[PDB]
Amino acid sequence: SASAVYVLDLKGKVLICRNYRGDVDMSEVEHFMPILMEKEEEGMLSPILAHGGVRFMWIKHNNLYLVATSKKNACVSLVFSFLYKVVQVFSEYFKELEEESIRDNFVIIYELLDELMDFGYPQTTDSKILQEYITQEAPRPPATVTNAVSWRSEGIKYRKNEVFLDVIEAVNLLVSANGNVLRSEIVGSIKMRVFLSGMPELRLGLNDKVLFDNTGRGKSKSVELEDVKFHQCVRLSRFENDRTISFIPPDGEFELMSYRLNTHVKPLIWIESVIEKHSHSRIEYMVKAKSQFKRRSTANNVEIHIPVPNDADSPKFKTTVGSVKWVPENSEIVWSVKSFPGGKEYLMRAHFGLPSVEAEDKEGKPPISVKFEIPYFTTSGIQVRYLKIIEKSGYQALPWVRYITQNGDYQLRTQ
Amino acid sequence: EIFELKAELNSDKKEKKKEAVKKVIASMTVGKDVSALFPDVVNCMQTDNLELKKLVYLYLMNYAKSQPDMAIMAVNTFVKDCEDPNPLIRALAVRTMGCIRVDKITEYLCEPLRKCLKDEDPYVRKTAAVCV
Amino acid sequence: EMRILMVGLDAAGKTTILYKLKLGEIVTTIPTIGFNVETVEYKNISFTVWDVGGLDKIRPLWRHYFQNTQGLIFVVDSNDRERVNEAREELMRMLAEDELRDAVLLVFANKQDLPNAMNAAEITDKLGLHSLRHRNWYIQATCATSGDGLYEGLDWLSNQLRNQK
Amino acid sequence: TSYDYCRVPMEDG
Ligand SMILES: Nc1nc2c(ncn2[C@@H]2O[C@H](COP(=O)(O)OP(=O)(O)OP(=O)(O)O)[C@@H](O)[C@H]2O)c(=O)[nH]1
Ligand SMILES: [Mg+2]
């Protein structure tokens, strides 16, 4: 129950303001950045700032503090998911989100912040449905805003009827400093690109372990879905009954399902390293990179980052495969190898200098974090199986799919 | 300086008052003290255009407490705008009726809100539900 | 092209004859708390009409159209002899301004379908319209549901506006 | 989209 949805600058003046209830006075926005500094410098950097009986919830985009005030007992995750959905809607309109937009596209953004919320309540937050009655180029509102099926306005027609599925692996990993796996989980996300005609219905075929166990085919290759969180479009009770993903799809880009399993198959890229940190002289990185997966796939454009001392100097990089640039902006090396086959080992040996006079504060030990990406390969073993198009017309659509293996936060610890 | 803007506001041409109200809410965006421009932007409100009345509703919302005595001159326009075939302007007038926090105003605002409760198109119904 | 008002005491029929001039209808109208504005394209002159109601709390709210104001129409309510005295005092309170001197007067004798109403000369006697210096005034009998006398007042107004052939 | 797609069966009854 926000009382004023704010967008501030990085200083503390108002880019755009939109109050609803009168519970928070408009003068109360002026205290936000001093409270931010006075709570940030003492370890209490919290998303819920406090000013007497007036609270401050906020998220931080690149140049923007989407501040959301409240005075009573606000439902908090409501307001934060409201603010992230406002961020995603504005990124659907304005492909970048800066101060150049807000102080100049203020014709339409006040109307958006009138539409999204009344008396503190998020009510109509789909981007595509908000497009067809809020334009920057007005009729009656579409009934899709009022209708139960609220993410697909009827009357959409394309000449062909293409549906593109993108299955994205994102391996999260955190290997400890001894050489063992702490956590090998996989956050997978199926992102679909749907161009269909009318009001269709799709039923997705997965090789689920649970659906095969309800059928009687849990002895072939299947995926153990430890948890799945679907989009709003999937009728969840039909999934609760017999693992059935029934949904009226949206138009264009959307995220279908956000699953999260565990997998005790080996890590994809192994990073053994040593650090001979001689004091006040130099440092050595005899790091090796082997791949545990099969010898058929190729890892595109990997970026094996290794954090270095903050004030090192005169780098040398004797490699065998792949370029190095030393990036002192974040004080990191970026060991990049473009074409990376499976099962091979590429060795790299760096060598720096280090200052004589020691620093005032210590530097911290950030982790190695690689940025690999592999197509046509899944570590999970998940395969999509079927996708039925249901339509009163009845036609031949073309469901296309590809398999992407990426990283999530693929960190490996250092010494 | 603002007398020039009030003179643009007291014109009769559409593309003058549209730039006038955009200049008013551009001053209100950075928070320039435009509170003396209340009693004449109330006049340039009953318009056929829709991208303009959202800005005037925005001005009435942001300066409702600011002019507690002059704010009576919107209620007949509210009960006119809550009687339209296009439901968007009705529900817009409804969700602006509720945010105006003046006790002298809310005396006359009950019966059009009652009429907008039992309306057909569910947009204004769910908007009047929040206005309750 | 020229602007005009319709002010006066409440329930005098001014919004009724306003929307009768607009569409040609007698529609349901509440007692007017805020304002009304329409436009009437008559004889190639758009009569921009600004109604301000006559409730007791909104009678001090007349000055905020009196900035940049060209004309005036003061609609009386003939059937209220008790309220015509305070209507005259409100009229003189309006007519005692340094800003309203370009506005000509147009009194519509309204609701002239009852025998309790006065004729178009007795209202002049009750108001004292002969003592109006710098005021081009003109009385006319107007009825709402029939519509007679409205366009005669618009004719006299159009004679006041243009100064040509 | 330099990674090219593959076609899945539609019905799989
Ligand atoms: N019989 C009859 N009744 C009339 C006539 N003209 C006006 N009335 C009555 O007078 C009432 C006046 O209606 P309005 O026009 O809304 O009142 P107003 O003069 O605008 O006063 P406010 O709305 O308060 O500013 C109407 O409801 C009618 O019932 C008429 O010509 N004949
Ligand atoms: Mg009236």
XYZ file of C-alpha atoms in Angstrom, chain A:
415
model
C 0.000 0.000 0.000
C 2.313 2.728 -1.265
C 1.166 6.322 -0.903
C 3.525 7.907 -3.458
C 5.542 6.148 -6.153
C 8.679 8.231 -6.644
C 11.523 8.329 -9.127
C 14.501 10.241 -7.777
C 17.861 11.136 -9.288
C 21.224 10.158 -7.893
C 21.226 13.396 -5.847
C 17.810 13.760 -4.203
C 15.572 15.905 -6.408
C 12.409 14.542 -7.980
C 12.443 13.245 -11.539
C 8.743 12.318 -11.382
C 6.317 12.048 -8.468
C 2.914 10.396 -8.228
C 1.068 10.310 -4.908
C -2.149 8.411 -4.331
C -3.522 8.694 -0.820
C -2.122 11.679 1.056
C -0.709 9.388 3.749
C 2.816 10.589 2.893
C 3.395 14.311 2.513
C 5.190 15.378 -0.651
C 7.816 17.245 1.395
C 8.935 13.941 2.939
C 10.835 12.935 -0.212
C 13.554 15.481 0.652
C 14.964 13.356 3.485
C 15.685 10.301 1.334
C 19.311 10.801 0.295
C 20.563 12.084 3.718
C 18.945 9.053 5.384
C 20.523 6.935 2.620
C 23.975 8.296 3.456
C 23.507 8.193 7.233
C 22.319 4.580 7.162
C 24.746 3.483 4.433
C 27.941 4.617 6.189
C 27.235 2.521 9.296
C 26.492 -0.902 7.783
C 22.703 -0.463 7.835
C 22.108 -0.154 4.094
C 18.573 -1.511 4.017
C 15.823 -1.305 1.380
C 13.452 -0.085 4.129
C 14.630 3.318 5.312
C 12.986 5.022 8.283
C 11.936 8.631 8.906
C 9.835 8.821 12.059
C 6.618 7.051 11.165
C 7.219 7.343 7.424
C 8.939 4.411 5.728
C 10.859 4.290 2.433
C 10.957 1.246 0.182
C 13.174 1.519 -2.877
C 14.972 -0.360 -5.608
C 17.940 0.928 -7.581
C 18.217 0.868 -11.349
C 21.250 2.361 -13.172
C 20.653 6.069 -12.577
C 17.294 5.802 -10.828
C 15.992 5.272 -7.306
C 12.416 4.048 -7.684
C 11.414 5.151 -4.210
C 8.070 3.975 -2.825
C 6.971 5.621 0.397
C 4.419 4.392 2.929
C 3.160 5.335 6.341
C 0.923 2.469 7.482
C 1.783 -1.240 7.526
C 2.414 -1.675 3.819
C 2.399 -5.087 2.178
C 6.055 -5.044 1.273
C 6.650 -7.751 -1.357
C 3.595 -6.360 -3.150
C 5.324 -2.981 -3.407
C 8.724 -4.386 -4.395
C 7.293 -6.651 -7.094
C 5.244 -3.647 -8.192
C 8.456 -1.629 -8.541
C 10.229 -4.349 -10.509
C 7.225 -4.694 -12.797
C 7.246 -0.905 -13.299
C 10.924 -1.280 -14.253
C 10.095 -4.049 -16.733
C 7.187 -2.082 -18.257
C 9.364 1.018 -18.694
C 12.050 -1.145 -20.276
C 9.355 -2.394 -22.642
C 8.560 1.194 -23.602
C 11.936 2.911 -23.286
C 14.803 0.555 -24.175
C 17.105 2.444 -21.812
C 15.987 4.063 -18.568
C 17.833 7.308 -17.803
C 17.061 10.883 -16.805
C 16.793 11.735 -20.516
C 13.509 9.808 -20.600
C 11.775 10.883 -17.403
C 12.178 14.666 -17.643
C 11.202 14.547 -21.340
C 8.704 11.683 -21.739
C 6.676 13.051 -18.825
C 3.654 13.354 -21.143
C 2.980 9.625 -20.944
C 4.671 8.496 -17.707
C 2.240 10.371 -15.440
C -0.562 8.600 -17.311
C 1.223 5.273 -16.797
C 1.632 5.936 -13.074
C -2.046 6.839 -12.952
C -2.995 3.621 -14.771
C -0.809 1.133 -12.872
C -2.051 2.044 -9.402
C -5.023 3.511 -7.538
C -4.977 4.060 -3.735
C -1.776 1.995 -3.500
C -3.012 -1.045 -5.426
C -1.321 -2.573 -8.490
C -4.059 -3.451 -10.921
C -3.022 -3.579 -14.603
C 0.655 -4.358 -15.158
C 1.104 -6.303 -18.418
C 3.134 -4.324 -20.948
C 1.563 -5.453 -24.248
C -1.975 -4.965 -22.927
C -0.999 -1.520 -21.629
C 0.359 -0.648 -25.096
C -2.950 -0.886 -26.987
C -4.593 1.936 -25.034
C -1.546 3.952 -23.911
C 0.443 5.025 -26.977
C 2.921 7.771 -27.799
C 1.636 8.229 -31.368
C -7.442 7.530 -27.345
C -10.110 4.852 -27.912
C -12.105 2.703 -25.533
C -9.910 0.447 -23.376
C -9.549 -3.142 -24.582
C -11.742 -5.707 -22.884
C -8.583 -7.784 -22.275
C -7.857 -5.326 -19.451
C -11.152 -6.364 -17.830
C -11.376 -9.958 -19.099
C -9.968 -12.949 -17.225
C -7.582 -13.798 -20.063
C -5.647 -10.568 -19.607
C -2.451 -11.018 -21.638
C -3.655 -11.739 -25.193
C -5.910 -9.271 -26.985
C -7.917 -11.002 -29.696
C -7.609 -9.903 -33.299
C -3.883 -10.593 -33.568
C -3.014 -12.063 -36.969
C 0.256 -12.985 -38.647
C 0.741 -14.455 -42.118
C 2.742 -17.440 -40.961
C 2.327 -18.682 -37.385
C 5.706 -19.200 -35.725
C 6.413 -20.122 -32.107
C 10.043 -20.093 -30.971
C 11.135 -21.788 -27.754
C 14.428 -20.957 -26.089
C 15.503 -23.295 -23.279
C 18.214 -21.561 -21.276
C 20.408 -23.392 -18.786
C 22.174 -21.192 -16.224
C 24.526 -23.173 -13.996
C 24.957 -21.766 -10.518
C 28.036 -23.071 -8.767
C 30.274 -22.114 -5.866
C 33.376 -24.294 -5.548
C 35.234 -23.820 -2.280
C 38.924 -22.974 -1.978
C 39.888 -26.622 -1.408
C 38.511 -28.161 -4.609
C 35.033 -29.525 -3.767
C 31.562 -28.558 -4.974
C 29.473 -26.776 -2.381
C 26.348 -26.218 -4.492
C 25.630 -27.471 -8.023
C 22.171 -26.161 -8.910
C 20.677 -25.179 -12.269
C 18.236 -22.306 -12.764
C 16.560 -22.939 -16.092
C 14.257 -20.533 -17.884
C 12.205 -21.203 -21.013
C 11.653 -17.946 -22.919
C 9.182 -18.159 -25.783
C 8.610 -16.009 -28.871
C 5.001 -16.588 -29.917
C 3.466 -15.203 -33.117
C 0.020 -16.792 -33.353
C -3.375 -15.867 -34.762
C -6.350 -15.509 -32.436
C -6.760 -17.073 -28.976
C -4.794 -20.348 -29.078
C -3.994 -22.908 -26.376
C -0.683 -24.678 -25.823
C 0.158 -27.798 -23.818
C 3.886 -28.230 -23.355
C 5.460 -31.673 -23.421
C 8.415 -32.144 -21.094
C 10.312 -35.302 -20.186
C 9.469 -34.770 -16.528
C 10.354 -37.469 -14.031
C 7.067 -36.892 -12.190
C 4.824 -37.114 -15.265
C 6.656 -40.259 -16.389
C 6.137 -41.742 -12.922
C 2.424 -40.986 -13.166
C 2.483 -42.576 -16.631
C 4.861 -45.492 -16.143
C 7.882 -44.474 -18.215
C 10.236 -43.261 -15.495
C 13.021 -45.586 -16.632
C 14.099 -43.695 -19.774
C 15.964 -40.377 -19.960
C 14.022 -37.818 -17.909
C 14.544 -34.628 -15.907
C 14.030 -34.324 -12.138
C 12.185 -31.028 -11.734
C 12.833 -30.125 -8.108
C 10.677 -26.995 -8.396
C 8.911 -25.124 -11.203
C 7.386 -21.642 -10.946
C 5.250 -20.926 -14.006
C 4.059 -17.659 -15.508
C 0.548 -16.326 -14.848
C -0.572 -17.752 -18.204
C -0.243 -21.396 -17.138
C -3.427 -22.694 -15.524
C -1.766 -23.960 -12.366
C -4.537 -26.225 -11.050
C -4.314 -28.319 -14.215
C -0.589 -28.599 -13.536
C -1.429 -29.586 -9.964
C -3.709 -32.364 -11.169
C -1.627 -34.228 -13.755
C 1.518 -32.113 -14.433
C -0.135 -30.407 -17.415
C 1.148 -27.040 -18.628
C -1.986 -25.489 -20.158
C -1.767 -21.838 -21.143
C -3.089 -19.186 -23.469
C 0.273 -17.740 -24.559
C 0.997 -14.019 -24.703
C 1.954 -12.244 -27.934
C 5.676 -12.015 -28.559
C 8.280 -12.342 -25.839
C 7.461 -13.793 -22.422
C 9.021 -16.086 -19.820
C 7.182 -19.399 -19.539
C 8.573 -21.292 -16.549
C 11.344 -20.705 -14.018
C 12.497 -24.084 -12.822
C 15.276 -24.894 -10.374
C 16.748 -28.354 -9.851
C 19.921 -29.875 -8.479
C 22.416 -31.999 -10.390
C 25.463 -33.855 -9.082
C 27.036 -34.245 -12.489
C 30.518 -32.634 -12.544
C 31.086 -28.894 -13.097
C 31.275 -27.845 -16.716
C 34.482 -25.797 -16.546
C 37.055 -26.573 -13.861
C 39.449 -23.822 -12.776
C 42.523 -25.027 -10.915
C 44.755 -22.080 -10.008
C 47.696 -21.256 -7.764
C 48.748 -17.887 -6.368
C 52.345 -17.236 -5.372
C 51.635 -13.862 -3.778
C 55.099 -12.686 -2.841
C 54.882 -9.639 -0.611
C 55.707 -6.309 -2.294
C 57.101 -7.994 -5.429
C 54.830 -9.893 -7.800
C 52.208 -12.623 -8.218
C 51.852 -15.740 -10.385
C 48.709 -17.340 -11.843
C 49.468 -20.824 -13.198
C 45.775 -21.376 -13.855
C 44.523 -24.305 -15.940
C 41.075 -24.794 -17.465
C 39.754 -28.254 -18.294
C 36.222 -29.145 -19.393
C 34.436 -32.164 -17.944
C 31.662 -32.567 -20.541
C 31.794 -34.549 -23.788
C 34.193 -34.119 -26.697
C 31.620 -32.974 -29.269
C 30.353 -29.553 -28.157
C 32.114 -26.194 -28.456
C 31.930 -23.524 -25.760
C 31.508 -20.130 -27.381
C 33.090 -16.900 -26.036
C 34.077 -17.905 -22.496
C 35.339 -15.201 -20.121
C 37.316 -16.704 -17.259
C 37.695 -13.804 -14.848
C 40.292 -14.000 -12.075
C 40.406 -11.125 -9.529
C 43.883 -9.672 -9.027
C 45.470 -7.246 -6.527
C 44.025 -3.759 -6.756
C 47.207 -1.849 -7.631
C 49.234 -4.344 -9.657
C 51.406 -3.148 -12.518
C 53.284 -4.218 -15.678
C 51.269 -7.324 -16.627
C 52.626 -10.181 -18.696
C 50.460 -12.932 -20.185
C 52.044 -16.031 -21.729
C 49.104 -18.100 -22.946
C 48.537 -21.004 -25.326
C 44.936 -20.425 -26.483
C 42.836 -17.291 -26.320
C 43.513 -13.631 -25.668
C 43.952 -11.763 -22.388
C 43.108 -8.200 -21.603
C 43.922 -6.998 -18.109
C 40.944 -4.850 -17.099
C 41.891 -2.564 -14.178
C 38.481 -0.879 -14.186
C 37.180 -3.650 -11.935
C 40.750 -4.870 -11.159
C 40.320 -8.143 -13.000
C 41.916 -10.140 -15.779
C 39.559 -11.347 -18.515
C 40.936 -14.545 -20.002
C 38.813 -14.989 -23.112
C 38.768 -18.057 -25.355
C 36.347 -17.955 -28.253
C 36.128 -21.531 -29.577
C 36.443 -23.917 -26.626
C 36.025 -27.636 -27.362
C 35.012 -30.147 -24.726
C 37.389 -32.388 -22.807
C 40.521 -30.395 -23.626
C 42.807 -28.398 -21.325
C 44.080 -24.877 -22.037
C 46.874 -23.564 -19.817
C 47.561 -19.914 -18.996
C 50.377 -18.402 -16.924
C 50.226 -14.741 -15.929
C 52.809 -12.626 -14.097
C 52.451 -9.132 -12.623
C 54.292 -6.686 -10.486
C 53.156 -5.376 -7.136
C 54.000 -2.150 -5.269
C 56.726 -1.929 -2.659
C 54.940 0.211 -0.070
C 51.974 -1.679 1.370
C 48.461 -0.278 1.247
C 46.375 1.317 3.989
C 43.413 -1.073 3.819
C 43.297 -4.676 2.692
C 41.854 -5.515 -0.686
C 39.497 -8.484 -0.332
C 39.478 -11.776 -2.207
C 36.742 -11.850 -4.870
C 35.979 -15.126 -6.662
C 36.783 -16.412 -10.113
C 33.595 -16.094 -12.186
C 33.502 -17.454 -15.737
C 31.039 -16.393 -18.465
C 30.704 -19.421 -20.741
C 27.876 -20.140 -23.197
C 27.225 -23.366 -25.132
C 24.536 -24.018 -27.765
C 22.911 -27.342 -28.714
C 23.731 -28.907 -25.343
C 22.016 -29.217 -21.955
C 23.730 -30.449 -18.807
C 20.343 -31.074 -17.161
C 19.087 -33.685 -19.614
C 15.761 -31.890 -20.065
C 14.193 -32.292 -23.505
C 10.980 -30.652 -24.635
C 8.740 -33.249 -26.277
C 5.521 -31.838 -27.747
C 3.517 -28.623 -28.058
C -0.107 -28.911 -29.173
C -1.706 -25.931 -30.894
C -5.435 -25.737 -30.169
C -7.496 -23.391 -32.330
C -11.102 -23.139 -33.504
C -9.699 -22.489 -36.975
C -7.135 -25.282 -36.762
C -3.844 -25.002 -38.615
C -0.200 -26.025 -38.805
C 2.054 -23.905 -36.630
C 5.834 -24.330 -36.484
C 7.245 -24.827 -32.979
C 10.977 -24.238 -33.134
C 13.396 -24.836 -30.280
C 17.089 -24.581 -29.458
C 19.134 -25.563 -26.417
C 21.369 -23.007 -24.714
C 23.765 -23.759 -21.874
C 24.762 -20.588 -20.035
C 25.993 -19.689 -16.573
C 24.092 -18.142 -13.715
C 26.487 -16.863 -11.059
C 29.208 -19.403 -11.814
C 31.673 -18.468 -9.097
C 34.739 -20.414 -7.988
C 36.608 -19.293 -4.898
C 40.192 -18.086 -4.599
C 42.985 -18.105 -2.031
